[PDB]
Protein: ArrX
Amino acid sequence: VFRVAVSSMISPLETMKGYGPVLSYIEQQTGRKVELVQRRTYREVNELIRENKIDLAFICTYSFVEAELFGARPVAVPQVEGNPYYQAVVITRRDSGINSLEELRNKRFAFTDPMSFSGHIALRGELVKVDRTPETFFASTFYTYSHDNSLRAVYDGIVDGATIDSLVFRSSNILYPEIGAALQVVHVSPLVGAPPVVVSPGLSEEDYQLIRRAFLNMHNEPLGKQALDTLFIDRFVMVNSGHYDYIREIAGKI
Structure:
């Protein structure tokens, strides 16, 4: 059995963003039965990787910085419009009268996961530049553990702003026209490498090299093209560890 970990509450069978076809592609290319190992938090997934309880993991960019150091081996990174990179976007309602990050001082703010770059760490990085923390900048903060729920909370006026994954913002806009319609990007982070796919430290070298070829050729296989449409990406390309140097810089400054 081939164990694939995701940090996501999205079902592989979801009508809208179901990634089941990604799992079918991995079955076809590895000739293994795939077992999905789904967890709410990034920390749970990194612990599974650290303990070799899984074979393959879709992890986040901050999680990767930590996971690389305990031997997680990089497979590939998604590419959208020729770009294997993304950024944090700070989102408000167009009708909020909140048109910049400075206008979110003393407002309610949503994070996703404490270990998310686009959902937490990027924004903590921006606030270092004005010598603040989220605790002394915003009126309140919250962890949604969901880029989609952070989006919905800004939409409903539950929070005044949120920081989310630019790729989720893009995909959300394709699936839910209201998002592009009612929400605005008021601030962005620096660019970093997109969220990578890794194997466990323990996975055999033979299996690792098989998976690497499967991901880097996904755009060449009909079931692979189906999988890429469910993930809203063009293809996978090789990981460049240097593309996460900014995340490493933020981490040191806390």
Summary: Residues 58 and 202 are 16 Å apart (CA to CA). The first strand starts at residue 2 and ends at 7. Residues 117-128 form the longest helix (12 residues).
